[PDB]
Design an enzyme around this catalytic site. Structure first.
Site, PDB file in Angstrom:
ATOM      1  N   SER A  61     -10.826  42.981   0.967  1.00 45.42           N
ATOM      2  CA  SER A  61      -9.625  42.897   0.157  1.00 45.42           C
ATOM      3  C   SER A  61      -9.433  44.057  -0.855  1.00 45.42           C
ATOM      4  O   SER A  61      -8.343  44.234  -1.374  1.00 45.42           O
ATOM      5  CB  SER A  61      -9.495  41.499  -0.465  1.00 45.42           C
ATOM      6  OG  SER A  61      -9.250  40.478   0.556  1.00 45.42           O
ATOM      7  N   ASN A 149      -4.035  37.153   2.083  1.00 45.26           N
ATOM      8  CA  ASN A 149      -3.938  38.376   2.931  1.00 45.26           C
ATOM      9  C   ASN A 149      -2.587  38.437   3.632  1.00 45.26           C
ATOM     10  O   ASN A 149      -2.035  39.505   3.844  1.00 45.26           O
ATOM     11  CB  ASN A 149      -5.005  38.417   4.027  1.00 45.26           C
ATOM     12  CG  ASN A 149      -6.376  38.695   3.481  1.00 45.26           C
ATOM     13  OD1 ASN A 149      -6.504  39.210   2.385  1.00 45.26           O
ATOM     14  ND2 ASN A 149      -7.420  38.371   4.252  1.00 45.26           N
ATOM     15  N   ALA A 309     -14.035  41.283   0.315  1.00 44.90           N
ATOM     16  CA  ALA A 309     -15.113  40.943   1.241  1.00 44.90           C
ATOM     17  C   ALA A 309     -14.711  40.884   2.707  1.00 44.90           C
ATOM     18  O   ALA A 309     -13.532  40.855   3.071  1.00 44.90           O
ATOM     19  CB  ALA A 309     -15.757  39.602   0.853  1.00 44.90           C
ATOM     20  N   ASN A 334     -22.177  40.285   2.068  1.00 38.14           N
ATOM     21  CA  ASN A 334     -21.195  39.620   1.242  1.00 38.14           C
ATOM     22  C   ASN A 334     -21.901  38.641   0.310  1.00 38.14           C
ATOM     23  O   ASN A 334     -22.132  37.503   0.692  1.00 38.14           O
ATOM     24  CB  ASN A 334     -20.167  38.880   2.102  1.00 38.14           C
ATOM     25  CG  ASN A 334     -19.226  37.993   1.274  1.00 38.14           C
ATOM     26  OD1 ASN A 334     -19.112  38.147   0.054  1.00 38.14           O
ATOM     27  ND2 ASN A 334     -18.537  37.066   1.948  1.00 38.14           N
TER      28      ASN A 334
END
Ligand SMILES: *C(=O)[C@@H](NC(=O)[C@H](N)c1ccccc1)[C@H]1CCC(Cl)C(C(=O)O)=N1
Length: 352
Positions: A61, A149, A309, A334
């Site tokens: 992101s 997103n 991530a 992550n």
């Protein structure tokens, strides 16, 4: 690098890597406008390839910052307007819930609950129109923020419509090239595969899987060298020579909405500096937003940041414009966001 920067960086990152079981990591600290690098471990555990300054990490992101800025660039060019309705650029979007949903809403996750992910089953351009046309808003436009997103990705795709270029060619030639980010890519070239680290999830090496609007929301891969100049570029945009891009960076850091002590920009998120860790240190978090009318110009005393991530990578960027201070943390694991934000804070606050 100066010993203070070196000791703080190590006193802090060492236990971070040890606690989170991080395979490899790259860190850049931008102090008074100069980059300082640090690297630990492996890009590829299997092939014993170490993390270096030229290793590419998936940004997740954090890619959104590039999209906010590309969007901001298209505005400065007069190609799009944030006050424009979404249907102005996707006329096939006739579902009636779009009346009133503007580009600003898409860019700021305030459209009304667009989903956090474009569902996996959406593969074609027709699959996508269908998904957006059938989406059911949970709220009125401009009332709540739901980090998605599918919201910022559509904004990215539509933002570059008038240009005539693919989202990728607009990004390459209008953001990457002018900023000399020569080792930052949406699709890593075969020639650059030797530097593409593997990400780790549960001990297995993984790379981001393709999916709809991935380039616009979580697709970019980059080195800490390029990320450092990216931070530098956003710290002091006045330094930038291409005009619309300078206004663009400025527009991404404008304060459009307020939620708690946080301010939503284009991609970037901001808080007033000085700030407290917990003010900045949960798979869904719907929160009310108060509109900032009109949007406050970029504020120098801010802690401008962005988390990101992928299944195998954890990223983080944070910078304080008025102090010429910035940091970039790239891991191929992550790990938890609070842990990243504390390391950043622990480091930048120790530098003034
Ligand atoms: C940005 O980092 C978001 N995650 C992603 O973009 C993932 N690459 C992704 C994309 C499509 C499908 C699945 C995962 C946000 C929002 C989603 C989550 Cl769970 C997240 C996180 O904190 O691990 N970050």
């Amino acid at each position: 690098a100066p010993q203070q920067i070196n000791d703080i960086v190590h006193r802090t990152i060492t236990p971070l890597i040890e606690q989170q079981k991080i395979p490899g990591m790259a860190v850049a600290v931008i102090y008074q406008g100069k980059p300082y690098y640090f690297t630990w471990g492996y890009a590829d555990i299997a092939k014993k390839q170490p993390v270096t300054q030229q290793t590419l990490f998936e940004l997740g992101s954090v890619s959104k910052t590039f999209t906010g800025v590309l969007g901001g660039d298209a505005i400065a060019r007069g190609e799009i307007k944030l006050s424009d309705p979404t249907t102005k650029y996707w006329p096939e979007l006739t579902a009636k819930q779009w009346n009133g949903i503007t580009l600003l809403h898409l860019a700021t996750y305030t459209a009304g609950g667009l989903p956090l992910l474009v569902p996996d089953e959406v593969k074609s351009s027709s699959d996508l129109l269908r998904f957006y046309q059938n989406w059911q808003p949970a709220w009125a436009p401009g009332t709540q923020r739901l980090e998605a997103n599918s919201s910022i990705g559509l904004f990215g795709a539509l933002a570059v419509k008038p240009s005539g270029l693919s989202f990728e060619q607009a990004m390459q030639t209008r953001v990457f090239q002018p900023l000399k980010l020569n080792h930052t890519w949406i699709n890593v070239p075969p020639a650059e595969e030797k530097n593409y680290a593997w990400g780790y999830r549960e001990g297995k090496a993984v790379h981001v899987s393709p999916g709809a609007l991935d380039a616009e929301a979580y697709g970019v891969k980059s080195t800490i060298e390029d990320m450092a100049r990216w931070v530098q570029s956003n710290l002091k945009p006045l330094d930038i020579n291409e005009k619309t891009l300078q206004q663009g960076i400025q527009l991404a850091q404008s304060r459009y909405w307020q939620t708690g002590d946080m301010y939503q920009g284009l991609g970037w998120e901001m808080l007033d500096w000085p700030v407290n860790p917990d003010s900045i240190i949960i798979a869904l978090a719907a929160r009310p937003v108060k509109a900032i009318t009109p949007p406050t110009p970029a504020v120098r005393a801010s802690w401008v940041h962005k988390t990101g991530a992928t299944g195998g990578f954890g990223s983080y960027v944070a910078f304080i414009p008025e102090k010429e201070l910035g940091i970039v943390m790239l891991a191929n694991k992550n790990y938890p966001n609070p842990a990243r934000v504390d390391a950043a804070w622990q480091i930048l606050n120790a530098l003034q």
